[PDB]
Design a binder for this molecule. Structure first.
Ligand code: NAG
Ligand code: NAG
Lengths: 114, 339, 55, 128, 37, 232, 369
């Protein structure tokens, strides 16, 4: 367990170096971040296989969080592409077509016989 | 006493007429025409369809020029159609919407119509003001008008449900000759080619022959078992045909004073609404209550063909003066021209 | 009424004396007229559509 | 011609019996519905009874229900009226009328004063 | 998500497009035991 | 010039068709009614309560224009001209059954003939039993000749749903509904949904008459509309 | 597998980023720490409390509509598999129901194709008969023709989407604007079909109840409601999808934005159901006034309701939601698919072939031919 615990910082450093080679200061892109994450996952899986344990251990999770905070905190990666709009704008946005349909049905009923 | 002997005397006259008619019946029309060549499968299709009328069409009439025609509808309109280009030339409203007859003057300058209003209206189509207005109104009848035909621009003959037929002078607008020989409602009339005489079939299932010049009945035809609805005159002027509610037609002749041949089939259980001969007189087109107009051969009792393009009951029909077209008017408010 | 009965017999009496002919003679006359004008009616016989105003 | 000859009648005491036969000619008897109408002296014309084309449907007026009997014979084209227990009001002239239009089950002007397809009529008088 | 009769014949289409590999012949089960999380 | 005549013909057709289109709306916005009241049946009063062969009377109720035709000065042979009214909305039938001397039986046969007419099989007929007040006074008369003409009245029983007019007596209600039952039996004998008979009781000067026919006409159109969608 | 692995890596990165921004549990008492098991991101949960999460769509073998549950032990740690004492979550639920669901979905797709083809055939023949026979022309016939046309076009669109969109995904991976245009047309035409159902119901109600005497009606309002208005919901939905949820081809149904188009349709169908109820009440009142037999009245009312159900789309209102039960849900799916995919065929065979006037016209013109 000690060997894998010591090798995990080496895997993190290798991932950081790979990200630095791909991206100068912003590893928040798509291809560069994908390559860095693939390398990090490869070395982390190798370390876990050396330890003979199922990842992620709480110590491993803490180390991963510390590595992400130390290096991958430059960009606001919290942005996600696809979302449903919040209810505050969503609810009236759905109510308006329904109320319009109900009102137009009565309007057509009224003016058809005129 | 006096009444009884009069009826007994009347019976003896009726018996003598039957004996006289039987004696003259040396042969029947069907036997002679047994060897005549059949017409063949007559196939006729619609060429024009006039959709200007709203309510059921009750009467129509062709013009002398064979181009223009006038039709009457129960909605209260008298539309004149140009059969060639399908357009309409005039559309004159009527005071009463209940009209059962219409006429076209031989000169083409006058059009008449009548119905349940007991009056006949005359319209002149050659007004110098560009609009058609009624000219003279005849109000000597007390029953619904059933038919009316022009002798010329000055005299018109009419028949109504008053059992009587009338002759009119348009200029004076007064009665001139009255015929009072029937016992039932007169449904139709047809002028002879020479105009000197005309026939009229009434509800008594009897057809009469009247002379316009002296206003006297010449003879009476019998043989129908139901009220006569329509009648027409043969082009040669020596015969006529009619149809009744008994689902059969009959052909008569003035000279022999008796029926010649009847047209009927076991399938036919519906009355006849309109009857008119063809230009040659060989084809007898008759409307029917079953939405059909069977083309009955004249010389042969066998049916030659049918036409069933009408949605509702066919009320009227008419063959052109030149014989180049036939127009029919049904209860579906659609005028159909057949060729 | 008596007058209606009287008017009936006079109609029958004056109608009885009208001249009449054999039915065959009248039947032959009708056939002769139809035969003479057979070619002149376009409804009886097929006709070309070129000269027909309804095409 | 369409004629409906009528035979019968005579002088009958009240409460007696009588028979009337109406003969038809010139048309198909079975195709036309037959009606019985009579004219009372000093009164209008009224309808008594009728029979369907095939004789399977019979209707009577209330005054003669259970008193008179109607029958038709399409074989010999005759219309019959059998009466029992006559009453003084039976005195009237009986007319044998018919439906102008054969195939339909309804008809108008059977009681009309100017009807055409009506029989000559027979006089039936009942008295003590 | 979407639970409506009008929302039908599209959810079925979505399921056919996703869970079926273009009408594939075989779809081996995905391990859900102790080996997988 | 043939071309010049073509333009004149086309514009004449266009003008006439425009007039016909305008007249179509006014024709479809009115409803036709036929008044077939029997002789001396008080049908004239039914009109005025609000050699001419017809008397056209136009009245409007609920902003709806109606066309009532009173056929007059015509012979009693009504076999032929009755077919002209096959397209009418409804045939109004007024019966003075109380005038029996035998007027009821004569009107009974006339209604039967109209009901079974081939052309009138699709036309609804609404019925008015006029002279209800005179019916009461003749029934109250000693030995009224209602059983003599109609012996079935001696055994007929009043239906439980027969609501009376406040102030009358059971005997006049008996004859009033007995005549109605016979008319209903005739109508229901062959009325297999094609047309319906509407029975009503009216007086000679009843102003409600225009309301009853207006309500009856509304039911006729509604029933016809349902028949279009095959719901009836 | 490669796409699934990339999606899993991206989800793991997103979960790590979210956990970086949410370090505090903010609760009380013992609890299990938030951890990334390998497939889904789990938050802190109290001891002895079962947590739930959406079931992932990494593999076709998993059903996204399901929910994965993770149990927290009372000791303050996650549940451990007894086989190897390792942290584990109830992922076996997503895999259990998939095979039978796929087997039923194949039959549902085949039934949909067959029903849509039959509806296309019957409705095309009915429209041809309606157009050829000019004697039947009226406002009701015009509305029927419009309804048949929108049925036919919607059925073609559904069939095309079923045969050349669902099977092949390479077009989806290409991501062309043509697919978005086709989806827009599909949604617009479905909305048009439902609004024309509403228009037919409105016309029937107006003919029967509110207006009886007047016959001529201006059909411009009906045309505008059937074809013009459905543009607005569809345009709004398209704008909203292009603004927020811009997927490959707008084929995703996980969005709540689908209620923009599917919403007003439900209101229109509810209005149609209420109009049907009013018409049934009127018919029952008329038959009661007619003095008809009770059994005959019930039978005729049932027949009228059965006749009017397919035209007004009452089936959607009767069974709006999908039952949670597996057997009842399967029965509901089968019945609803059979009803929906045959609605056009039922309308065509009821209002055209079973109509008496149409049958008489067919018989009359057939004799001429
Ligand atoms: C659990 O989370 C808390 C707060 O984030 C942290 O202080 C603690 O060290 C974590 N423990 C483990 C075992 O991850
Ligand atoms: C997952 O939960 C379901 C809920 O019924 C249960 O049946 C199943 O046994 C659970 N999985 C395991 C591996 O126990």
């Amino acid at each position: 367990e000690t060997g894998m615990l010591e090798r995990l910082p080496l895997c993190g450093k290798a991932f950081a170096d790979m990200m630095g080679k791909v991206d100068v200061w912003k590893w928040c892109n798509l291809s560069e971040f994908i390559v860095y994450y693939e390398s990090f996952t490869n070395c982390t899986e190798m370390e876990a296989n050396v330890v003979g344990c199922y990842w992620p251990n709480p110590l491993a999770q803490g180390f991963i969080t510390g590595i992400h905070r130390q290096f991958f905190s430059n960009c606001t990666v919290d942005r996600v592409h696809l979302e449903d709009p919040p209810d505050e704008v969503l609810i009236p946005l759905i109510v308006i077509p329904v109320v319009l349909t109900v009102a137009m049905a009565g309007l057509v009923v009224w003016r058809s016989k005129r | 006493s006096e009444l009884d002997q009069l009826r007994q005397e009347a019976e003896q006259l009726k018996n003598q007429i039957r004996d006289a008619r039987k004696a003259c019946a040396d042969a029947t029309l069907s036997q002679i025409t047994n060897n005549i060549d059949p017409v063949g499968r007559i196939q006729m299709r619609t060429r024009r369809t006039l959709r200007g009328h709203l309510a059921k069409i009750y009467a129509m009439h062709w013009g002398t020029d064979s181009r223009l025609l006038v039709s009457a509808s129960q909605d209260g309109k008298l539309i004149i159609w140009d059969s060639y280009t399908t357009n309409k030339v005039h559309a004159i409203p009527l005071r009463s919407s209940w009209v059962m007859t219409c006429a076209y003057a031989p000169s083409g300058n006058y059009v008449a119509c009548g119905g349940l209003d007991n009056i006949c209206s005359i319209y002149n189509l050659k007004t110098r003001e560009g609009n058609v207005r009624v000219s003279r109104e005849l109000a000597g009848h007390t029953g619904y008008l059933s038919c009316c035909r022009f002798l010329d621009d000055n005299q018109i003959v009419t028949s109504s449900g008053d059992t009587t037929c009338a002759l009119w002078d348009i200029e004076t607008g007064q009665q001139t000759t009255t015929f009072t020989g029937h016992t039932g409602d007169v449904m139709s009339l047809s002028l002879a080619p020479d105009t000197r005489l005309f026939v009229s079939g009434a509800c008594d299932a009897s057809a009469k022959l009247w002379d316009v010049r002296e206003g006297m009945c010449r003879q009476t035809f019998t043989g129908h078992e139901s009220d006569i609805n329509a009648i027409c005159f043969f082009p040669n002027g020596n015969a006529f045909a009619t149809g009744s509610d008994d689902a059969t037609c009959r052909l008569f002749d003035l000279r022999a004073d008796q029926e010649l041949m009847t047209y009927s089939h076991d399938n036919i259980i519906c009355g006849i609404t309109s009857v008119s001969f063809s230009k040659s007189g060989r084809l007898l087109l008759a409307g029917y209550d079953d939405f059909n107009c069977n083309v009955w051969d004249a010389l042969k009792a066998d049916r030659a063909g049918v036409l069933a393009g009408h949605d509702n009951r066919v009320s009227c029909l008419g063959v052109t003066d030149d014989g180049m077209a036939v127009a029919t008017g049904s209860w579906d408010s659609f005028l159909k021209i057949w060729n | 009424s008596i007058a209606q009965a009287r008017k009936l017999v006079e109609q029958l009496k004056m109608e009885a004396n009208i001249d009449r002919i054999k039915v065959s003679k009248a039947a032959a006359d009708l056939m002769a007229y139809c035969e003479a004008h057979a070619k002149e009616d376009p409804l009886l016989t097929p006709v070309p559509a070129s000269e027909n105003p309804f095409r | 011609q369409v004629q409906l000859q009528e035979s019968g009648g005579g002088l009958v005491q009240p409460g007696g019996s009588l028979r009337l036969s109406c003969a038809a000619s010139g048309f198909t008897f079975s195709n036309y519905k037959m009606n019985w109408v009579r004219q009372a002296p000093g009164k209008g014309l009224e309808w008594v009874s009728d029979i369907s084309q095939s004789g399977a449907s019979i209707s009577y007026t209330g005054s003669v229900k259970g008193r008179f009997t109607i029958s038709r014979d399409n074989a010999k084209n005759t219309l019959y009226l059998q009466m029992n227990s006559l009453k003084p009001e039976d005195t009237a002239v009986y007319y044998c009328a018919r439906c102008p239009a054969p195939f339909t089950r309804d008809c108008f002007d059977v009681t009309s004063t100017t009807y055409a397809y009506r029989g000559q009529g027979t006089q039936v008088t009942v008295s003590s | 998500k979407c639970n409506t009769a009008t929302c039908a014949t599209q959810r079925l289409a979505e399921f056919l497009r996703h869970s079926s590999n273009n009408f594939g012949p075989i779809l081996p089960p995905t391990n859900v035991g102790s080996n997988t999380p | 010039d043939q071309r010049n005549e073509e333009k004149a013909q086309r514009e004449a057709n266009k003008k006439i068709e425009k007039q016909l289109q305008k007249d179509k709306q006014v024709y479809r916005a009115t409803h036709r009614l036929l008044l077939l009241g029997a002789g001396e049946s008080g049908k004239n009063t039914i009109v005025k309560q609000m050699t001419s062969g017809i008397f056209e009377t136009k009245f409007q109720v609920d902003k709806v224009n109606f066309h009532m035709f009173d056929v007059g000065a015509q012979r009693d042979e009504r076999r032929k001209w009755i077919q002209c009214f096959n397209d009418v909305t409804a045939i109004i039938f007024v019966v003075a059954s109380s005038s029996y001397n035998n007027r009821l039986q004569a009107a009974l046969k006339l209604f039967d003939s109209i009901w079974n007419n081939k052309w009138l099989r699709d036309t609804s007929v609404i019925l008015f039993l006029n002279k209800q007040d005179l019916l009461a006074e003749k029934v109250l008369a000693g030995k009224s000749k209602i059983e003599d003409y109609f012996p079935e009245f001696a055994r007929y029983t009043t239906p439980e749903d027969a609501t009376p007019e406040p102030g009358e007596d059971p005997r006049v209600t008996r004859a009033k509904y007995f005549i109605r039952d016979e008319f209903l039996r005739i109508s229901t004998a062959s009325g297999d949904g094609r047309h319906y008979c509407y029975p009503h009781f009216t007086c000679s000067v009843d102003t409600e008459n225009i309301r009853r026919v207006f309500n009856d006409c509304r039911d006729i159109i509604q029933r016809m509309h349902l028949r279009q969608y095959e719901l009836l | 597998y490669v796409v699934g692995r990339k999606k899993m890596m991206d989800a793991q990165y997103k979960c790590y980023d979210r956990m970086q921004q949410l370090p505090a549990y903010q609760g009380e008492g013992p609890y299990c720490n938030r951890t990334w098991d390998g497939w889904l991101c789990w938050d802190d949960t109290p001891a002895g409390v079962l947590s739930y999460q959406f079931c992932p769509d990494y593999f076709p073998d998993f059903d996204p509509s399901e929910k994965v549950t993770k149990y927290c032990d009372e000791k303050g740690v996650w549940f451990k598999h007894p086989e190897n004492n390792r942290t584990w979550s109830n992922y076996t639920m997503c895999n259990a129901f998939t095979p039978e669901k796929l087997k039923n979905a194949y039959v549902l797709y085949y039934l949909a194709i067959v029903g849509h083809s039959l509806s296309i055939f019957t409705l095309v023949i009915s429209l041809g008969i309606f157009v050829f026979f000019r004697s039947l022309g009226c406002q009701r016939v015009t509305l029927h023709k419009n309804m048949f046309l929108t049925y036919i076009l919607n059925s073609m669109i559904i069939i095309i989407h079923l045969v050349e969109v669902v099977p092949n995904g390479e077009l989806v991976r290409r991501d062309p604007v043509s697919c978005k245009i086709l989806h827009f047309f599909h949604q617009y035409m479905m909305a048009c079909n439902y609004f024309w159902m509403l228009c037919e119901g409105i016309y029937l109600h107006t003919l029967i109840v509110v207006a009886v005497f007047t016959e001529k009606q201006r059909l411009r309002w009906y045309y505008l409601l059937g074809w013009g208005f459905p543009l607005v919901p569809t345009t709004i939905h398209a704008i909203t999808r292009a603004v927020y949820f811009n997927d490959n081809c707008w084929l995703s149904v996980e969005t709540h934005l689908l209620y923009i188009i599917h919403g007003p349709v439900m209101a229109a169908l509810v209005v149609n159901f209420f109009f049907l109820l009013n018409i049934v009440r009127v018919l029952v009142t008329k038959m009661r006034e007619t003095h008809e037999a009770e059994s005959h009245m019930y039978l005729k009312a049932v027949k009228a309701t059965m006749i009017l159900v397919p035209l007004l789309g009452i089936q959607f209102v009767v069974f709006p939601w999908r039952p949670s039960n597996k057997m009842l849900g399967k029965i509901y799916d089968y019945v609803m698919h059979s009803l929906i995919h045959f609605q056009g065929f039922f309308v065509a065979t009821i209002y055209c072939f079973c109509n008496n006037e149409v049958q008489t016209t067919v018989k009359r013109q057939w004799a001429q031919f």
